[PDB]
Amino acid sequence: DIILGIRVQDSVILASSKAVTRGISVLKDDKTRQLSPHTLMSFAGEAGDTVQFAEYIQANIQLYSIREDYELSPQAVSSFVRQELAKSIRSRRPYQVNVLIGGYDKKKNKPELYQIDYLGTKVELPYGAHGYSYTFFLLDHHYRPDMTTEEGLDLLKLCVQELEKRMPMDFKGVIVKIVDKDGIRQVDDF
Amino acid sequence: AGLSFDNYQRNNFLAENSHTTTIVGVKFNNGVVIAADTRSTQGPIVADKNCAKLHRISPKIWCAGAGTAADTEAVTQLIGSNIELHSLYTSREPRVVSALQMLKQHLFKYQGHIGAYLIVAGVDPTGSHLFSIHAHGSTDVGYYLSLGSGSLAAMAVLESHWKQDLTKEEAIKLASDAIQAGIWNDLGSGSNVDVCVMEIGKDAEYLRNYTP
Amino acid sequence: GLSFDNYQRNNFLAENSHTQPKATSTTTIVGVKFNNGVVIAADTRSTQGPIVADKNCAKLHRISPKIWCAGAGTAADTEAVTQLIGSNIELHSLYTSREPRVVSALQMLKQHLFKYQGHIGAYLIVAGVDPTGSHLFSIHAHGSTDVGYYLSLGSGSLAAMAVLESHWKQDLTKEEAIKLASDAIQAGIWNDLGSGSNVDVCVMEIGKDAEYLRNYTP
Amino acid sequence: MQAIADSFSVRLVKELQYDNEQNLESDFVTGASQFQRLAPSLTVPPIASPQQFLRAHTDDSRNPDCKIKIAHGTTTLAFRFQGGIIVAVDSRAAGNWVASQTVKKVIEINPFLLGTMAGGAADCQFWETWLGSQCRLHELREKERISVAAASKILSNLVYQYKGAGLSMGTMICGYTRKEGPTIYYVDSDGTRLKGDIFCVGSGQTFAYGVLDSNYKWDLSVEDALYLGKRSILAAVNLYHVTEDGWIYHGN
Amino acid sequence: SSINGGIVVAMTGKDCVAIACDLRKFEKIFHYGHVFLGITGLATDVTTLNEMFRYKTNLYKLKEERAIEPETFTQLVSSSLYERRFGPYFVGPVVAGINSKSGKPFIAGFDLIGCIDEAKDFIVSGTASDQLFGMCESLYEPNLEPEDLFETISQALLNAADRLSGWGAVVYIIKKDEVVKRYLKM
Amino acid sequence: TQQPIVTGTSVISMKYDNGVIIAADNLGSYGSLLRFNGVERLIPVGDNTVVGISGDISDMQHIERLLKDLVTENAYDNPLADAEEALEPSYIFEYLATVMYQRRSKMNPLWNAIIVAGVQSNGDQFLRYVNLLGVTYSSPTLATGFGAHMANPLLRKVVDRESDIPKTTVQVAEEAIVNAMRVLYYRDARSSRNFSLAIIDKNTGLTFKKNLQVENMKWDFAKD
Amino acid sequence: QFNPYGDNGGTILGIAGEDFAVLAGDTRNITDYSINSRYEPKVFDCGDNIVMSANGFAADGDALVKRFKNSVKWYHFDHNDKKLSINSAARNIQHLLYGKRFFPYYVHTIIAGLDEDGKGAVYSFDPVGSYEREQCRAGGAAASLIMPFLDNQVNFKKPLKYLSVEEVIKLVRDSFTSATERHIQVGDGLEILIVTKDGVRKEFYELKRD
Amino acid sequence: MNIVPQDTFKSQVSTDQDKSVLSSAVPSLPDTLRQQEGGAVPLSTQLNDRHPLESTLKNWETTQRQRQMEQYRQIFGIAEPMKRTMEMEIVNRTDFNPLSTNGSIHRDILLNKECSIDWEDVYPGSTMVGDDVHSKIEKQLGI
Amino acid sequence: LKKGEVSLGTSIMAVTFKDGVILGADSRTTTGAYIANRVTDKLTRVHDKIWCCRSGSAADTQAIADIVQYHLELYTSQYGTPSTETAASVFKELCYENKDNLTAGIIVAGYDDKNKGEVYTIPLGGSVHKLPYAIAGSGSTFIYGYCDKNFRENMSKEETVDFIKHSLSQAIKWDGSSGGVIRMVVLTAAGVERLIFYPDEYEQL
Amino acid sequence: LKKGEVSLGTSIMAVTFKDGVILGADSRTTTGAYIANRVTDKLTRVHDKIWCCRSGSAADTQAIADIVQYHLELYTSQYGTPSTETAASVFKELCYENKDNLTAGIIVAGYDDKNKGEVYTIPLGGSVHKLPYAIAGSGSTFIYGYCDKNFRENMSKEETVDFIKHSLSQAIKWDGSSGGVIRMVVLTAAGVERLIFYPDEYEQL
To answer: Which ranges are cleaved off as propeptide (chain B)?
Structure first.
């Protein structure tokens, strides 16, 4: 259920769990939606509402990209996501949801990472994590603004090793995606 | 449209998760006087030592409120706008009975969820009027009325020294004495006294800091 | 006396995982007074909740050879209280070398029930004869007593009371009183699900031995 | 204007509540339109808290035959391979329900799709019949066989529109199409749609899943797959084989 | 570990009684001479009652210089249960026996505070509404031989068990002279 | 309503060989206070039908208004609505039961118990009962409230089976009902001495008696 | 808060014969240990060789029967008086029951009739709409006594297939008699509807009037 | 003759209860993209945990007008409510301004609110879908 | 009733006499134990000769009285002076149709040429009863026996005035929610008369 | 009041007249809406010319009355006939010292050659008050005003009998828990006199 995000000087690395639902065992990613060719969204929280919200956001962003024949900036995407999340709970009990948005602004050629909680509080962060009750110790002590992609991957591997030290066999693994100037890639070895 | 109910469920969810004055009115033989204290407290702390608690609905119709301050101010302003529009439409001096009816119906519409307890005094061509209005939509008529946390001392003073035929000066003195007793004997009342006197055929006289 | 041990343990078991076994809660009881004695009758069918447990239950208790009672509520409490008062009455009669009186048993029962502040669930109808005459009383579980000519108790007490109000008069014979009590118990049996089967009768007359009848209806 | 005049002219009908069109339709007063609505209408109490009312008046066991039936759900396992999809359920039950035929624990949505039953039995039966009708209408409209993903998403949206209302159902849609291949989706009443390859649901799901994972291969044989499914079931027995031509029952 | 709960069946024959209990050691039936008692409920309370009754029956035999009769034992159990009026054990006991002087079989049952429930046909304790009391009533026939009574009680136990897994039963057949103890490891 | 405020006590009815007899006392109690002493709880609807309502007074008046509207509408635009169009007790009871069930399904029930008695067109006796939940049932004898626990045992001793109806005369049934009313007055705090009676017969047609008081009361034994 | 639910405590039994069907019901209405009524119909004839019964809340069952009859009438009107089949009736009853999913009926329903093959068919419906086809189905408090009695004598694999209409009626009457002798809420009467290719036959057997 | 609004709850619910936002692919399900409600708002959530005053406020003026019409019908006849409703319908139907939501002057004159202000008037009340003139035209003309 | 809402703990008495009707009440409004107003006019005029007294919630009763007065003005604009039965029917309909949300009880005293003065009572729940006389309020419970013992039909004006004065004096004496002055309205054929009595007058009776 | 007990809802009166005292009561004992005992003698005697009537909880009042009779027997053995004041003091002490466990209220009537008849009332709580007349019970609230309007000092025996009969008849009429017959005990210099009045006599008043 843990979602992680590290913003290195030229890339965004998003990590998520593989799959877990109720007490049902499955083999089988269903927690990351590609909003834009250079913008990715990772969502965690209650099952049933988070997926619907992510699909709604992805549909809206794809419609905007089709209409304008242009790619919306990660900041505008984050603002739209925050507004939609705040609107969704304006007339009902709030549901647990945490969203990490990682993008690469082409106009400024800069990676960006944003975190939105269940009430709709968008915060721009160099690194972010949810679902862990800590893990910020490694993310704070060994973080630099000028870290390369390899260094960020090594830090993420250290965090994953820490996770795979106090968890049962249910921890299948970690799915890792990288957003940079060349687009969105998936990391298999790490 | 109107007052919103959005984020009501969100507010309840946050609450479940640990996320958180003396007024008198005296009617004398040719008019009405309304007096109030001038201290605003945010609990134990005195926020303001000189606050105007006498609000105006019409040039010759004034009121003073208690309960929820925002609700009292909003309802008074809305009724003032309605009264001004009605007077412009009819080209006549507004009546205290019309303001009473509008306030009563508006307060009964919300079934007591708008907390505003008012003393409304005024003078219109039919005479002088003084009413007390409850937050649920019930109104009462009297010759002398008191309101607020210091209303008991004020009522004692009014009962001590009230007569049928009172002059303007006697009524002003009686209202000032009632507010002074409320100020001295009640912790929530203090500072100065604000007075508003309304006679028949004369402009309303508004005296801030009548007794400092 | 009665132990209070394992009270906290029982509360913990009830509040965590266990259910305390229930106690038998006893069913029409009637008492009719005629010109020279009293008659006390009771239904003989006992049901464990919605299931009938026995078609012949002896709910008539003996305090003295001429003082009898019938109880409703907790059966164990009724039996224990009646037996204790009977032992006290026997000892008192031996001490005074005189026939026991109904008023003495009434006083003992009332004081004992008031001692426990209603925690003993026994509601009794006590009839008897003594050198002073024939007596019939009703005793509440909290220690209050009442005097009457005809009394009814139990789940089907309303039908029995209706029958008694229908066919009771001051001058009655033994046979008429027995018939009236049997009719009241029968009405409680037919018009209520808490009573059934036969009727137990006990007749106490002045100057004669008490007559106990089991299964009077057959 | 004449309708306006009629609407302001007049008691006995009002108390019978026949002045409402919904009451007339539900009682077949003027026609059979109640059986003409493709999307069924569900009745709720006209009170401030329908959900807690239903929960309190449902969690009250007084009559064994007045309770809502629950699907067996002992152990159901589904997997896919090059030859299609193998689904295995338990033929375990008696309870005063003597019948000519055995109880069917797998819903036959259509000659090409299978739906596992779990949780509430009535919810699964009703909503999968509705899903089959929707899929048939879609096939008639598009002149093509509807994909398993489309049907699973339709069911997920349907169960999500009533989330928290009281539905308790979890199903596994299994199908085989030329467009996609073999597909298995899991949809529960919460609103979770999960595509998978190996699924095990029930009390003995852990042992069956372990047995399956011990000897699972994409390239196997139909006999090998059926034997593996039966062994996984028996570790804690009806069998279904779904291929492009449809589903065939291999119960034993 | 579990142990709590169980079933006890008592039936009266011609000149004999039959008392049977279920079993997975820990047996719910204990004898104090020629009187048998089976207790259903918490294992701790069952053991406590067994120890207390062994104590009291040993003292009774030492004083009276004779064995204790089923009626006297029934009265003793009732009084002992009523002593803990406000702290009662979570138990249901059943007493069976043969009066050594008159020969008439005796069976009785109690609630948790000692209300005596004496039945002339049969008594079921632990569960008396699911599948035991009705089947015992259907299978009961008065005035049966000891072998017929044993067969009836074994059939009743098997019927209750069916309505398979690890199941056993202990059955005692009591005559005026000798007692036969049998198991049902089926 | 959510809860009743002013309530009635009980209505009791039974069948005899030629018709039915119904009775109910006249009292409206405001809690523990016997407030009103002029409330009539027996409504003669039509020619040979009587409806007895026990419970909330406001809902009883609402039901009376409904019955009056039904009577007026049945005879509306029908000059011959007196011989073949006369309302039968079965139709009135069916309408009342449907109304009660529909309002129960609306979560806004009528806090009443209704007993409908009369003689059908073919001379058959009709006697049925319905409650606030909408559940209806029929029996040779019927009662509500405390009368369901005390008056019913007294009446069933006269008519216990269906075959007992032809054996029961009008005098016996009337005496039994009067005795039941007296017993109810004996052992009911909310009861009233005054009561009203209605006899529906297939020969005479109807007889409604008001201002009836419980007589022959025995209190002399209280002297001791 | 107002409680709109209740129970009346009946007993129903439906048996699918080789060329017929039997639906029998008991009469009893008592609550809070007080006797209310003993005579009320429990088995209704819906026509088209379909017989329906509902046990539970009396008002709920009556409303369900009324709705089904109105639906059958409209189906006849709108389809040139076409006869309705047993399975179509079962589907209609399932939809009617599930239309109240969040305000459920507190009743259990059993229907019986003849299919297109002429063989007796019986369907049992769960309170919210789960329906199934069974040869024999007993509902109520006395089902736990009626069902073992039937299973002891006849076999559903004297075989039930060769049983006659009179034999099945006798068996049902004896089962109800045994339940009355053992249970305490069965008696007064027994209303039986028999569905054959010639129509529907009614038989009211008078048990003890206790 | 009501004062406080009554019968504000819904007896039944359905997935296609709002015909204006039906999905074209599956006409029996709502279209979440065109709803623009955030995408995580099931209809069931609209049945529980509501403020006990929202229904009273949203149906207050309608209830008052219905009571007034009932009084007119009782005292004056059918013609007076018929004429009032006819005038109101004619005024409402002939006004179509997709670029504004403010009511017409004639509507306020008919409702006797020429010189009356409530919080509805003070507070009358981005999206990529369904906020153009064409959507309002389709809603108005039933297209 | 709602939390913090004013309740009408009054003493109301309407009596019909040979020449019409008299409706009387006290003048105290309380807030539990503190007297908010020593002098109040509880006699509400709905029509020129149709008056009423209110109990229960003050706001709900005031709204109902205003609506009924508006309805009677509309009726008078068409068919002239209404009757007490019509006003009672309107009150009953308003109270019964709104009993699920409003707490209100009314006592209506009227006069007309046809009926020559009548009294109606509408308690909580919305049922209308026509009585020769009616008493209501917190203090009314203390004068049930007194009023029952001392009521006659077709009394004179002074006899009815004395009866109401004595009964209301006793109700004020034994009740803590009843106030100083007694206000009575006499509705007869001659017109409407208003009478007021002070504590120093009736306390010496 | 402990749950499941019996409440003594009744109509109790005690009136002092020229030649002594009279204590009157009804004879109804109800458990909810059901009359458990319609013939009840509520005139408890604690001494030859000292009587009392009880209210509250039946068991507690009976225990207190028994203890008071024991105390008065001891006093009579020691010093002779006690005065009504002594019995009232014992009642007050017993009720006050156990007011946290027992709910009891007593009305004590007595006579002696010195004081010539006295009435005392101990309401719930344990306070004592000496009055020319006393009323108590659930049905008393309806006759308060009546009792305040028809009591005179030094009435004759017949006048007091009529006054008590009328007041208790009204209380029975207006109270649901009051009914049956009226029982009165007259305590004078001559002795103790018992009077019983049946419904057919006082209902015609």
So the answer is: 1-20
List residues of chain F with CB under 8 Å from any CB of chain I: 1-2, 4-6, 30, 33, 36, 38, 56-58, 61-62, 108
Beta bridge partners of C69: C61, C126
Which residues on F lie below 8 Å from J138 (Cβ)? 32
Could you list the residue range(s) of the whole structural domain that residue D236 is in?
74-252
C-alpha Rg value of chain A to the nearest Å: 16
Q: How far apart are CA C67 and CA C105, in angstroms?
A: 9
Helix (H) or strand (E) holding D108: strand D106-110
Residue G58, min C-alpha distance to chain F (Å): 6
- β-strand partners of B195: B35, B207
Method in brief: cryo-EM
Yes or no: say if C58 and C104 are a contact pair by the CB < 8 Å rule.
no
| Rounded Cα gap, residues E30 and E23, in angstroms | 14
Domains for chain G: give ranges and CATH numbers.
Answer: 1-210 (3.60.20.10)
How far apart are the C-alpha atoms of I162 and I171, rounded to whole Å?
14
Is I127 in CB contact (< 8 Å) with chain F? Answer: yes
CA dihedral J159, J161, J167, J169 (to 10 degrees): -130
- Output phi, psi for E176, to 5 deg: -70, -20
Question: Measured between CB atoms, does F104 come within 8 Å of chain G?
Answer: yes
What is the rounded distance in angstroms from the CA atom of residue A55 to the CA atom of residue A58? 5
Instruction: Name the CATH superfamily, with its identifier, for domain F1-224.
Output: Aminohydrolase, N-terminal nucleophile (Ntn) domain (3.60.20.10)
Q: What is the 3-state secondary structure (H, E, C) of D159-220?
A: HHHCCCCCCCEEEEEEEEECCCEEEEEEEECCCCEEEECEEEEECCHHHHHHHHHHCCCCCC
- Contact between C150 and C119 under an 8 Å Cβ cutoff? The reply is no
Q: Compute and round to an integer the Cα radius of gyration of chain H.
A: 19
Q: Mapped to the 3 state alphabet, what secondary structure does I68-108 carry?
A: HHHHHHHHHHHHCCCCHHHHHHHHHHHHHHCCCCCCEEEEE
CB D168 within 8 A of CB D189: yes
- CATH number, position J139: 3.60.20.10
Flag if D103 and G132 touch (Cβ within 8 Å).
yes
Q: Are the C-beta atoms of residues G101 and G67 closer than 8 Å to each other? A: no
Quickly tell me which residue has 């031509």 as its tokens. D245
Show which residues on chain C lie within 8 Å of chain F, measured between beta carbons.
149, 158-159, 161-163, 165-166, 169-170, 187, 190-191
Instruction: Give the resolution in Å.
Output: 2.7
Residues of I in contact with B114 (CB under 8 A): none
Instruction: Report the first-to-last Cα separation within chain I, whole angstroms.
Output: 37
End-to-end alpha carbon distance in chain H: 38
- D120 domain residue, yes or no: yes
User: Residue E22 is part of a domain; what is its CATH number?
Assistant: 3.60.20.10
Angle at J69 between CA C124 and CA C99, to 5 degrees: 50
**C213 in Cβ contact with C202 (< 8 Å):** yes
- In angstroms and rounded to an integer, the radius of gyration of the C-alpha atoms of chain D is 22
Give the closest of I63, I71, I74 to H3, CB-based: I63
Single-letter code of the amino acid located at F29: S
Is D122 annotated in a binding site? The answer is: no
The owner of tokens 């001891």 is J74
Taking the alpha carbons of E175, E176, E179, E180 in that order, is the dihedral positive or negative? negative
- The domain that holds D108 is classified in CATH as 3.60.20.10
- Written as six digits, the tokens of G105 are 């009926």
Which residues of chain I have a CB within 8 Å of the CB of H76?
74, 78
Whether F95 and D12 lie within 8 Å, measured CB to CB: yes
Helix axis angle for G86-98 and G58-78, nearest 10°, is: 130
Beta strands across the sheet bearing D106-110:
D106-110, D113-116, D170-177, D181-188, D193-196
Identify the bridge partners of residue E117 per DSSP, sorted by sequence position: E109
